[PDB]
Each structure stands twice: as C-alpha cells, then as structure tokens.
Amino acid sequence: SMENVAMPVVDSENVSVVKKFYETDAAKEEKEAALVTYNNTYSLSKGIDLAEKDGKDFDVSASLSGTVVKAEKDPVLGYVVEVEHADGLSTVYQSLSEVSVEQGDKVKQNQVIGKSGKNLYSEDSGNHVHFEIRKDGVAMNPLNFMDKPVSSIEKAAT
Amino acid sequence: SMENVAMPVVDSENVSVVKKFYETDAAKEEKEAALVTYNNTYSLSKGIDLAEKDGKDFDVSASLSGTVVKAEKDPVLGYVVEVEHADGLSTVYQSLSEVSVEQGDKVKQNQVIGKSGKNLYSEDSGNHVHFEIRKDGVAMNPLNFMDKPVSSIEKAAT
Amino acid sequence: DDLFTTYRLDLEDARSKEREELNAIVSSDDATAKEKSEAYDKMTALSEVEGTEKQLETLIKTQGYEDALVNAEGDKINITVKSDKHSKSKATAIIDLVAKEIKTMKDVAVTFEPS
Amino acid sequence: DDLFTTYRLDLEDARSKEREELNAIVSSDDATAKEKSEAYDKMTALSEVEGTEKQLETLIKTQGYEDALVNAEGDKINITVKSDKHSKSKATAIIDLVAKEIKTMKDVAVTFEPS
C-alpha cells in the first residue's frame, strides 16, 4: 500500500520483456507469442518474462514490500519466490538461478531477492525471470500495473 | 383380480411363441433371438410374439378383463390395443390387422379384440401378435405370468 | 454435415438449459418444499444419466467401435454406433454393457450408422 | 494399453464418487446449513465443469481432431488432443475454444499426443 508497483529488477533499463501475459483478445500473433512451450505441451503465460540484451545474469528484486512466503528450487521452474503483500496481493518470481531470501524474510521494494536463470519450463525465454502479480491467487497482466499505485490493482474486477 | 392370466388367443393350441421377452441373464443365443430388428436398429423384446404354424391369421383376445384405453392403427406397429386392468396392470396387443374394439370399450377375458397381422416393426415374426403385460408402465415377461392368478404379478419387485 | 457432433452439441445445449431450470426452482423462494425436492431429484438423476452415457460410450469405444453416442434420458436408451457391419451378435454385445436395472425398466435401442 | 479410455474411465469413477458424497452431505440431517449450501454449490459447479468438458471436446473434434480429452475441474484446465503435428498455431486455435472467464481465472494447458 502507498507504494507503486515496480519492475522486478535493479537495472530496469538493461532488460526487455521477452514474453507477455496471455490476453484472449490480442491478435493471433500476440497470443501465439504469449504461450509457454514445454514439450508438446503449451500453457498460457501468467506473467511477463524479462531478459537482458545478451541474456546475461541479472539481479531480480522485490517489486513491492512484503513477506516471503515461498522460496524453493523446483527442478522444472528453477528457484521460485513468492512475496506476500497487502490484501491478497502477492508477486511471483521464478526461473531464478539463485535466491537471496528464505521463507519468512520480510523484504522491501527493490531489495534484491535472486538472480535470473534459465529453466526447463520456458527454455524459449532463455536466461530470464518470470514475474507475476496475483490477487487472491489469480494472475493479472503485470504490464497493466507497472508504476501504478498499489490500489489501481484492487480496483479490478468491476 | 380373481382371475388368471390367459394366453391372448382363442385357439391357444394352434399357435406358438416365435419371440420371447428379452432376459439379460439368458444365453447369448436366447438374447440374440429376443431382439426386435428394424433396419439397422435393434431393440429389446418387451413381450412375446405368437404366430400360427403356417402364419395364417388368427383371432386375438383379451388376456384379462379391463377397459380398452387405446386402439389405433400405427403405420409401423399395425393396430395397437392396450387394455387397462386393476392396479396399474395393463396389457398390450400390437401387430393387429384388425380391431374389434375401440377406446372406452370394457372387455372380458377371452373376448376377441382383433386379428393377427404383419408389421413393419418386427417383420421377422411374420404374421403375429405382439403381447405385453405391464405394471405401472413397465413390461415384464409374459411367460412368467401365464395361468397364474392376477396377484402373483403384483408380488414382484421384492 | 456430421450428425454426431450436431447431436452432442444440441444435447448439451438442452441439458444446460435443463440444469439451469432445475437449479432455478430449487433456489427459489417461491417454490414449495415438494417442488424443490422434486427438482432436486430430477437434478441428481440427470447427473447420473450424464455419467451413464459417458461411461457407456467409453466402454463401447473400447470394444472396437470408432465412435458411439448414447442418450439415456427417457423411457428408452438410444445408442448409436458408427459401423458398416451390424448384426444380432454385435448388438447384443453392446446391450450387454448396459446396467441390469436399466434393461429391466427401460427399452434399449442400438442403431449402427455407416462409417 | 490406451491412455484416453483409461483416463475417461477413472475420471468417471472419481466423478461418481464425488457426486455421491456431495449428495450425501446435502441430504444429511447432521450437516449444517452452511455445509449443505457449499456441498450444493460444489455439486452444481461440477455439472457445469462436466458440461464444459463435453462441449469443449465436441468443439475440438469438429476442428479436425480425431479425439480430444478435457479436464476442467481444478485451477488449470488440461486438454489433451490426439495429433502428430503440434504448433503454436494449432494450440492457440484450441485455446480459443475455451471460455473467456476460464482463461481469465485459470491456466489452460494443451498437450498433443502421437496418434
């Protein structure tokens, strides 16, 4: 609360979004490109993927302040961190190589919490972080909320 | 009531059953032979078919006393007569060439009510009558009830 | 034109509407206890009909039929099977898949459509 | 072994048991109003899930898929399609068949199995 939603990175200028959150009303091409491809499994993207121009490692940081409710290495997802904020809101960082937090850690906004990495889940996004904002468990488009006060999020659905 | 279930024919000695009521626990052969065949439709037999040795016409008669609740020519079934008895019991005569009754007629046991005929529905039973006993609408095996008092019928299910 | 997909579609549509109305009665301040109770029974039976048809269809398919369609809703059970050859043999093996209490209480018909 | 028929069978079995338990709670003198009410909601949602899966399957099949299987029960919707070729194209045309409010609230996965 009282704060704005931040890019989950420290050096935000040196990364780009390489995959977007799936939107059902987007053109065919954009839907195709918002797919998570595993083997002969496709799944919908429930967040954005950020990668650096040359796919070098980079530090991921908390998009908002909260409490780390999850921090674990998954053999398919890489490290996965999930930070609880106010009002059933929470954020998810996943595909991490390293973690700088553990369950129960309180973090502050922009506090580094891990390092980008590659993944089994989306090998197509190379070295990256997958990032998600969820309200009471359901994933919404990150790009919709970037730099907006915490509240503009809890004012959808309507 | 008070009476026994009769063969639905006047000259019972000169006809034979040419199709039986379908029983799920009978041998394969007997199940196969208790099928009603239409075109590439098969249906379960819900009664017996009676025909005379040389498939000559013969007179059908009421198996029990009651009130004719139905009497009409059906282009697939031939004439169909349905006689209401006591206690949701009732009998069905179908494949008739002719009818000697009409809706609302009270008939007595052995009173002729029509003539055998051929049918579209079961062409395989040639010139015959299809006969059914139903309790509250559901068809039971006629052969189970032949010559038994009216009551032995209303004492299944159990 | 493909008669199977049209039928399944129309059946579904119809079923949906059905559930919605049952649910509507059951949920309504203006229904009597009797009416709620009966709508509720029609509702749970419908599910079981739904379950019966899906399972029957799955079973038939396992018997080497390329596709099958089964409507178990009324007084009769209608079953349509894709097939070029049909016989009393084949039909009776299909009717064998149907529950006893169904065959005891209801007629059962099995049609074989050119594949 | 055929994975589709096994799954449909096991799903059904499982669903049956499910309905039976929901019905059992709803019908029980020992359930509270809250509990009946929630069991009742789980029951009606399940039907709708049932309906959603049957319709989705029918639709896909109409799009030239030889068979399809759809489980819409949980947080994710799983859809398995018989097919030798798979692509981002093909998958997205399948995901297009799914309701908006599903895609808005739930993940959706589509797997293409060798036919």
Swiss-Prot record, chains A, B:
Domain of life where this protein originates: Bacteria
Keyword field: Membrane, Sporulation, Transmembrane, Transmembrane helix
Covalent S-S links between cysteines: none
Membrane topology recorded in Swiss-Prot or TrEMBL: Single-pass membrane protein
Free-text function comment from the UniProt entry: Involved in forespore engulfment and required for anchoring membrane proteins on the forespore side of the septal membrane. Forms a channel with SpoIIIAH that is open on the forespore end and closed (or gated) on the mother cell end. This allows sigma-E-directed gene expression in the mother-cell compartment of the sporangium to trigger the activation of sigma-G forespore-specific gene expression by a pathway of intercellular signaling.
The protein's name in its UniProt record: Stage II sporulation protein Q
GO biological-process terms attached to the record: sporulation resulting in formation of a cellular spore
Organism: Bacillus subtilis (strain 168)
Main location: membrane
Record note on quaternary structure: Interacts with SpoIIIAH and SpoIIE.
Entry's localization field: Forespore membrane
GO molecular function: metalloendopeptidase activity
GO cellular component, one term: endospore-forming forespore
UniProtKB/Swiss-Prot annotation, chains C, D:
Alphabetical GO biological process terms: sporulation resulting in formation of a cellular spore
Described function: Involved in forespore engulfment. Forms a channel with SpoIIIAH that is open on the forespore end and closed (or gated) on the mother cell end. This allows sigma-E-directed gene expression in the mother-cell compartment of the sporangium to trigger the activation of sigma-G forespore-specific gene expression by a pathway of intercellular signaling.
Keyword Cell membrane: yes
Superkingdom assignment: Bacteria
Residues spanning the signal sequence: none
Subunit structure comment from the entry: Interacts with SpoIIQ.
Keyword entries, A-Z: Cell membrane, Membrane, Sporulation, Transmembrane, Transmembrane helix
Coiled-coil ranges (or none): none
Protein name in UniProt: Stage III sporulation protein AH
Topology of the protein relative to the lipid bilayer: Single-pass membrane protein
Predominant localisation class: membrane
Subcellular location: Cell membrane
UniProt key word Phosphoprotein: no
Name of the coding gene: spoIIIAH
Any one of the GO CC terms: plasma membrane
